Design a protein around this ligand. Structure first.
Ligand SMILES: [Zn+2]
Length: 597
């Protein structure tokens, strides 16, 4: 009968056999570059990546004559659907070539961003001279001049390419039978043929906006409290009900505000939890962290890293003159070979990133038994949310008390707990309204709601009423604020962070419900509960074999976005905050603006 599937299976077997070795020596070569950057190394990475991309493109062509309706299995259909994608080659040669030469332009000059100090004696760049200026500062004029000087230069040259890039991305989107660029990016959450365990492309936009509404009371309370704290910082340019200027947004993008800790501390006489001296008095090294971490994983059934970790992977930067990338990285080389790199140190932040790197790799070991094309997470957010929830339990006071990092008689005060809330909110949660509304801006930009002639001026126009941030000096159409971020030029999605955050909170709530912990969610501990690990394994094993819809239900019990765990987690803060607005106005007053009047 010779069903097409019986030859597509042989084709997929050949593809797996070739691609396993291809990526394995590519990843082996990839490791040799991160740990050793030379002239020879970059060349062979370029050759290997070019060969891999060419082979993938040939296999994408070879997937074309075998249709998708000839496979009834959903899991097998997913592999062909992933492989069938070609890319930008669908249009004519000239448009594709202009795409490649435009992408080259945003690679070279874009990375050479420069600012000019008013005084010539000091010259600073974005890394790290400027970053100190925006983030680590306690004055107004330095931030103002940095904002003006940086934004004055980069917009003019970089604005015109964005519209051409957008229209060309739309043209490739239409080439692949998609309605627009939004539908091109909204296809990552579409499930068809599964049944009731499905998700709609437009349902994500509607549900996220609905979840934003429940955030608004707590967001207003917190923003009012932080504003009342902030009037002591800039009395002469900010009204007690006015918006924060764009040059007092914490940093370049408003994403990281961590360095502003000394100014906005509620209780400055209560010290934060910092036991850094204690492990230095107990001779704890980075290696010892990895085995005490295992003690938590064995409680949930997760084993340790393979033997190749102990010898091949280095726990610190080499000192033989070779310069490396010190960012902690997660590597899945394949073929049972796994290597792990970071310039870790004995610090609490590195203490958490060590468990992230250990635990986020553990996801790879969970689905390592899946086929090579199914050796991935459920989606973009699941993989990056599994790692973060691991360190949540490692930072609990009980875990440190039982691990020797805390005294046996140590008692934590509720005022001490107050710092931990503000810290992790300021790190992860505080940007959730910002991230959601920025992606709303992009979606209406993608949907065409924002007219083409006001693409950048409505970013500032709705900023007055909706974003509640006032600009210090209006700029004309030539300027491009998104050009200040390196990720924009490289086409990096921003909904991944929001999905990761929501999935991480859902995972934490599900694990705590399984752990049968009682009380507010922040006191939850899942250590030593062997029954809680079997439930986790039920979700870890599936990997990419099942959709996120059903994978989320396997651990949580529901197949919908939920912010009730978030409200429960912040319940004490709400109960302590609702009375605060008695003597303060709620929201940001749009009547008073610093720029016009
Ligand atoms: Zn990770």
């Amino acid at each position: 009968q010779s069903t097409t599937e019986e030859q597509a299976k042989t084709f997929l077997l050949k593809f797996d056999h070739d691609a396993e070795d291809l990526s394995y020596q590519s990843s082996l070569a990839s490791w040799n570059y991160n740990t050793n950057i030379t002239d020879e190394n970059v060349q062979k990475m370029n050759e290997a990546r070019a060969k891999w991309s060419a082979f993938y493109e040939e296999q994408s062509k070879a997937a074309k004559m075998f249709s998708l309706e000839e496979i009834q299995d959903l899991t097998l259909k997913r592999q062909l659907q992933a492989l069938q994608q070609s890319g930008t080659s669908a249009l004519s040669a000239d448009k594709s070539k202009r795409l490649n030469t435009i992408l080259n332009t945003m690679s070279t000059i874009y990375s050479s961003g420069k600012v000019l100090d008013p005084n010539t004696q000091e010259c600073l760049v974005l890394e790290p001279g400027l970053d100190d200026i925006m983030e680590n500062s306690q004055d107004y004029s330095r931030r103002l001049w940095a904002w003006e000087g940086w934004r004055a230069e980069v917009g003019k040259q970089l604005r015109p390419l964005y519209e051409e890039y957008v229209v060309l991305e739309n043209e490739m989107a239409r080439a692949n039978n998609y309605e627009d660029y939004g539908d091109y990016w909204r296809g990552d959450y579409e499930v068809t043929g599964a049944g009731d365990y499905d998700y709609s492309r437009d349902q994500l936009i509607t549900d996220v906006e609905r979840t934003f509404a429940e955030i608004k009371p707590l967001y207003e309370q917190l923003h009012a409290y932080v504003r009342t704290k902030l009037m002591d910082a800039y009395p002469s340019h900010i009204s007690p009900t006015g918006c924060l200027p764009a040059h007092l947004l914490g940093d370049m993008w408003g994403r990281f505000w961590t360095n502003l800790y000394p100014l906005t501390v509620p209780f400055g006489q209560k010290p934060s939890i910092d036991v850094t001296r204690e492990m230095e008095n107990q001779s704890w090294d980075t290696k010892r962290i990895f085995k005490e971490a295992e003690k938590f994983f064995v409680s949930i059934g997760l084993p340790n890293m393979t033997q190749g970790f102990w010898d091949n992977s280095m726990l610190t930067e080499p000192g033989d003159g070779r310069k490396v990338v010190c960012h902690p990285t997660a590597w899945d080389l394949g073929k049972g070979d796994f290597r792990i790199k970071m310039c870790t140190k004995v610090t609490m932040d590195d203490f958490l990133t060590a468990h992230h790197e250990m635990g986020h790799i553990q996801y790879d070991m969970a689905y390592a038994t899946q086929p090579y094309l199914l050796r991935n997470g459920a989606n973009e957010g699941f993989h990056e949310a599994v790692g973060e929830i691991m360190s949540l339990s490692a930072a609990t006071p009980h875990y440190l008390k039982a691990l020797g990092l805390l005294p046996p008689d140590f008692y934590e005060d509720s005022e001490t707990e107050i710092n931990f809330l503000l810290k992790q909110a300021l790190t992860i949660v505080g940007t959730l309204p910002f991230t959601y509304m920025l992606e709303k801006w992009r979606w209406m930009v993608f949907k065409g709601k924002i007219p083409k002639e006001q693409w950048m001026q409505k970013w500032w126009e709705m900023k007055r009423e909706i974003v509640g941030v006032v600009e210090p000096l209006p700029h004309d159409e030539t300027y491009c604020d998104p050009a200040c971020l390196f990720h924009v030029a490289e086409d990096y999605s921003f909904i991944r962070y929001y999905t990761r955050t929501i999935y991480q909170f859902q995972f934490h709530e599900a694990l705590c419900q399984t752990a049968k912990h009682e009380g507010p969610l922040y006191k939850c501990d899942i250590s030593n509960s062997t029954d809680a690990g079997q439930r986790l394994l039920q979700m870890l094993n599936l990997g990419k074999s099942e959709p996120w819809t059903l994978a989320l239900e396997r651990i949580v019990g529901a197949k919908t976005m939920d912010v009730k765990p978030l409200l429960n987690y912040f319940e004490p803060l709400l109960t302590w905050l609702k009375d605060q607005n008695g003597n303060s106005f709620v929201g940001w007053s749009t009547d008073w603006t610093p720029y016009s009047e």
